[PDB]
Amino acid sequence: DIVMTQTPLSLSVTIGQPASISCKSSQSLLHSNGKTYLNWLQQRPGQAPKILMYLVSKLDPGIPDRFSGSGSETDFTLKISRVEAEDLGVYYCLQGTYYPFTFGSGTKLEIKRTVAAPSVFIFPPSDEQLKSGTASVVCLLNNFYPREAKVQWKVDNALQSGNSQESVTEQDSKDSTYSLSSTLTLSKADYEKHKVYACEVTHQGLSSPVTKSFNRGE
Amino acid sequence: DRAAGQPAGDRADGQ
Amino acid sequence: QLQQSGPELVKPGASVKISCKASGYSFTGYYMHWVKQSHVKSLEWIGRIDPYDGATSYNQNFKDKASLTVDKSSTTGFMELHSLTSEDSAVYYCAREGHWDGDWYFDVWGAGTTVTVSSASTKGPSVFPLAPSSKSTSGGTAALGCLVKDYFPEPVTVSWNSGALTSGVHTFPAVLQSSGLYSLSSVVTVPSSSLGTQTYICNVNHKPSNTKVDKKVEPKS
């Protein structure tokens, strides 16, 4: 089968800057009928792949003109003249010359934007869950950049380890920011054993770490 | 009209 | 243009059949291809089918693993996976090879079907509200959400106000708990003035267990 090598595998581009992705095939993609069946695809987070270009340089009519394609028999290049926020996703090359169809490894295009401080919110455990015998406290970091952020759980000013998990959304297609949710899970017995619950957030946008807290029962 | 496609879909077309 | 069936939980060694409903075009005039997405960025071509006569062309890797059929009366394409292992847990897509200016390419894709191969039974999620309060308001904007906890397998669909509220919504990716079950949160930022007037409902649907929950999030003092 034809091997499709994409370089690079990850790419960070600022809004308005060019971007280039290369694809190299193990054999010449020029078919005997004279056509070169090379396709470029884009896969945005949570969506199916979509054809950007087919036959090396022909754009699908819906695709904006800032995407372009070039390349010969074995070396190919996808170019974005001016990267926009919606261009985030994974880019594939697809050959249609030799059976079977083979895709590339995929190139992740990430947007670079200025630092943005997170909005911090904390949520006490619900009454429905406390009836079940467990307690979950959620700390929300909303719309921040970069992706690196430190969330520490302190229960009565005691640092917690091994009882919380974090999740961070993929980059936003409009403002290119991230959001993070940290869930501190304790038994109902342990939750009633303490009073003050706080998450301490450390981030590049914050000059000093921000702390949101609540007292159990208010 | 019948379906056609890129040669990689069939072994006889691309291989 | 292409509508795929819902998520499947399949025991190892069993079979699963997923569908791809076509509409708005001549069904018998276009190939229907199937693509597997195993990892985050891994795409494999499974095969194609001619819906007119059912002629199939398979990738050598998926021969004896996938079977392609079509129902011309319902204009639906099917892929059956045989003797499933953990390696078959993936997202499967269907695509149409369309025609434009004498050239052919994958111009229409389905949303994808998540297939999980596991010996465990489905477990429905518990939905708890993340109530807005003074500790979740920053400068006239409030934050509220829902906690979808302890479910298996993937995925879960969360909407707000039956799809009426989309601005400011963040549905976080599911995390794997130490118990082996998934958990996610869905939050939304709204004006703090609308807390008394506007009703906010999160709609949680876990198709593998037929769990539909509509939980209204109410403010707290």
Domain of A155: which CATH number?
Answer: 2.60.40.10
Tell me if chain C has a CB within 8 Å of the CB of A205. Answer: no
Q: Give Cα C33 distance to the centre of its chain.
A: 19
To the nearest whole angstrom, how far is the Cα of A35 from the nearest Cα of chain B?
10
The total domain count for chain A is 2
Pairing of strands C8-10, C113-117: parallel
Q: Do A99 and B6 touch (CB under 8 A)?
A: no
User: What method was applied to determine this entry?
Assistant: X-ray
Domain C2-117, second-level architecture: Sandwich (2.60)
Instruction: Locate CATH 2.60.40.10 in chain C.
Output: 2-117, 126-217
Whether residue A146 has a cis bond before it, omega within 30° of 0: yes
DSSP label of C22: E
d(CA A1, CA C44): 12
The single-letter code of the amino acid at C158 is V
H or E element, residue A215: strand A210-215
Assess whether A89 and A41 both reside in one domain.
yes
Q: Among A55, A79, A112, identify where a domain stops.
A: A112
The answer to whether C69 and C77 are in contact (CB under 8 A) is: yes
The answer to whether A17 and A85 are in contact (CB under 8 A) is: no
Q: Among A69, A87, A112, identify where a domain stops.
A: A112
For every residue of A179-204, DSSP letters joined together read EEEEEEEEEHHHHHH--EEEEEEE-T
d(CA C41, CA A108): 9
d(CA A11, CA A8): 7
Assess whether A171 and A128 both reside in one domain.
yes
Nearest in space to C206 (alpha carbons), one of C136, C123, C110, C91: C123
Burial of C77 (0-12, 13-18, 19+ CB in 10 A): buried
| Residue whose tokens read 């993070």 | A180
Contacts of B4 in chain A (CB under 8 A): none
Contacts of C59 in chain A (CB under 8 A): 100-101
Q: Is domain C126-217 given the CATH code 2.40.50.140 in the classification?
A: no
d(CA C212, CA C206): 7
Considering only CA atoms, give the Rg of chain B: 8
Contacts of A61 in chain C (CB under 8 A): 100
Domain around A205: 119-215
Tell me if chain B has a CB within 8 Å of the CB of A101. Answer: yes
To the nearest whole angstrom, how far is the Cα of B4 from the nearest Cα of chain A?
13
Chains within contact range of chain B (3+ C-beta pairs < 8 Å)? A, C
Assess whether A101 and A124 both reside in one domain.
no
